[PDB]
């Protein structure tokens, strides 16, 4: 029955749009998983089953230690028979149910080993399970039916009247939950790094919590790590300031639309 799919094969992409890959297509138990440019190779195909297993090359994705910092690998599924498995959150966090560690690309570069780490909601801990791994190009519409625009030589962001094809009004939504300047994909929308300011700005992508954004069904753009959402300062578009705020029902400044 269609309400109970028995399995589905797909890819998994994350940080910088790279894919979860069983390095070298090795099958030995304990073979590590890394991030690598997406392709059609079998070692990037992950099959999901109702037992909470995620498999490639016939083996199961798994953490390799109870504590943080160790690699994620593939291993004989029979060794996980008495195991709860993985749980994926609605925001793309992939968590070992028992240990609570989450799939992470932790290094300063995404060309790295994947490990099981404590969850902090970093962009480097955000994943898009799905065969279509490309960034999604879109405009982001907010208060007064205006569009978010990258300004000041790609350092700031605020709302301006929507203009079709105005380059700086386009954003690339990545698999790691980043929102990137469409024409300069090394730059990401970021919550403030200065505690004195709540201003959202544009900075070099770095995998941080500041750069992970979730488009929620309720219409907000949420930063899960900071338990806050994007908001138009004082509900006034003319202030040219977008800030991070606790979610509130007062005003319409926390509502946004993705127009792709």
């Amino acid at each position: 029955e269609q309400c109970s799919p028995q399995q589905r094969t797909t890819r998994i992409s994350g940080r910088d749009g790279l894919c979860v890959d069983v390095y070298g297509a090795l099958t030995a138990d304990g073979s590590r998983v890394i991030l690598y440019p997406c392709g059609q190779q079998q070692n990037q195909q992950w099959t999901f089953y109702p037992d909470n297993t995620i498999r490639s090359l016939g083996k199961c994705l798994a953490t390799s230690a109870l504590s943080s910092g160790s690699n994620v690998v593939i291993t004989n599924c029979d060794y996980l028979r008495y195991d709860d498995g993985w749980m994926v959150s609605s925001s793309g966090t992939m968590m070992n149910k028992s240990s609570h560690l989450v799939l992470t690309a932790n290094a300063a570069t995404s060309r790295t080993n994947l490990t099981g780490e404590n969850n902090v909601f970093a962009a480097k801990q955000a994943w898009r399970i799905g065969n279509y791994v490309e960034p999604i190009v879109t405009t982001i519409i907010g208060l007064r039916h205006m569009c978010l625009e990258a300004t000041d030589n790609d350092t700031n962001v605020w709302l301006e009247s929507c203009v079709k094809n105005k380059t700086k009004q386009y954003w690339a939504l990545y698999s790691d939950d980043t929102i990137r300047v469409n024409n300069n994909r090394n730059l990401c929308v970021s919550s403030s790094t200065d505690s004195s300011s709540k201003l959202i700005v544009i900075r070099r992508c770095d995998g941080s919590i500041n750069q992970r954004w979730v488009f929620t069904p309720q219409g907000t753009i949420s930063n899960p790590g900071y338990e806050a959402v994007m908001d138009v300062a004082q509900n006034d578009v003319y202030l040219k300031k977008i800030v991070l705020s606790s979610a509130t029902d007062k005003g319409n400044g926390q509502q946004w639309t993705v127009f792709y």
Binding site: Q2, C3, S4, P5, Q7, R8, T10, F48, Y49, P50, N52, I54, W86, M87, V88, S90, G92, W127, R128, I129, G130, N131, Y132, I136, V137, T138, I141, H145, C162, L173, F215, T216, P217, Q218, G219, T257, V258, F259, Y260
Partner: protein
């Protein structure tokens, strides 16, 4: 009834109307992991309809009856006359518009049926201010030659817009710029797959959010994006509610 009038039809009032329509349809909805409301099911006939009024530029009003289970139109009223789709629930005529002269339209409330009867498809049917107004008029007087296209217009500008923020946004653009448009692949792919997305989203609860089948949703550049999980913003921040599909 919740209503919209052409005498005050701005992007703000349209947005409020759609927002409220979603609210009303989602009363009593269920929710799953995705957080997208699932419409009610097995609703007693005496409660199955939500009435909404639309007024044209002539101060002429129609009342449309929306089935709360599927967000589709079942019938409408104009003055002392009412019209029911062939596929309206069989007992609907005893529940709504009882004090009118009732008529049955010789076609179903589905796009496929409407397009066959009218001989015109959604791709060739303009949407926009003029069309919304005219559609209300054509339905008010029940001009048979224009009833089918009038439903293509209103179903999309009202109901499909309620179902999908992307569609609502297209209509907003049309109002703000007073620029008519025809739906392209992006809009049509949403309309086409609403039930399928509903099924896959619900079914995905048992598969860590992964679907049993992929759904192709086109973007504004006419590129198909495969949506095979709940992890696509073009779905999860777009589809406002779903059809009940899975226990």
């Amino acid at each position: 009834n919740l209503s919209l009038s052409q005498s005050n039809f701005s992007a703000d009032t349209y947005k409020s109307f759609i927002k409220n329509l979603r609210k009303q349809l989602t009363i009593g909805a269920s929710y799953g992991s995705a957080g997208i409301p699932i419409l009610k099911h097995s609703v007693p006939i005496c409660e199955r309809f939500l009435l909404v009024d639309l007024t044209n530029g002539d101060n002429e009003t129609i009342t449309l009856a929306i089935n709360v289970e599927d967000a589709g139109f079942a019938a409408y009223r104009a003055a002392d006359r009412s019209y029911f789709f062939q596929n309206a629930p069989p007992i609907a005529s005893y529940v709504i518009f009882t004090d009118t002269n009732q008529n049955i339209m010789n076609f179903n409330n589905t796009f496929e049926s409407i397009e066959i009867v009218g001989g015109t498809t959604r791709s060739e049917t303009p949407l926009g201010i003029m069309h919304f107004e005219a559609s209300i008029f054509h339905l008010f007087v029940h001009d048979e030659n224009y009833v089918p296209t009038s439903f293509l217009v209103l179903i999309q500008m009202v109901l499909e817009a309620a179902k999908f923020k992307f569609i609502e946004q297209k209509v907003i653009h049309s109002i703000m710029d007073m620029e008519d448009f025809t739906p392209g692949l992006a809009m049509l792919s949403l309309e086409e797959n609403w039930t399928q997305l509903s099924l896959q989203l619900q079914a995905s609860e048992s598969l860590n959010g992964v679907f049993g089948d992929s759904v192709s949703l086109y973007n504004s550049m006419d590129e198909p994006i495969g949506v095979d999980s709940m992890y696509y913003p073009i779905l999860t921040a777009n589809m406002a509610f779903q059809l009940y599909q899975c226990p």
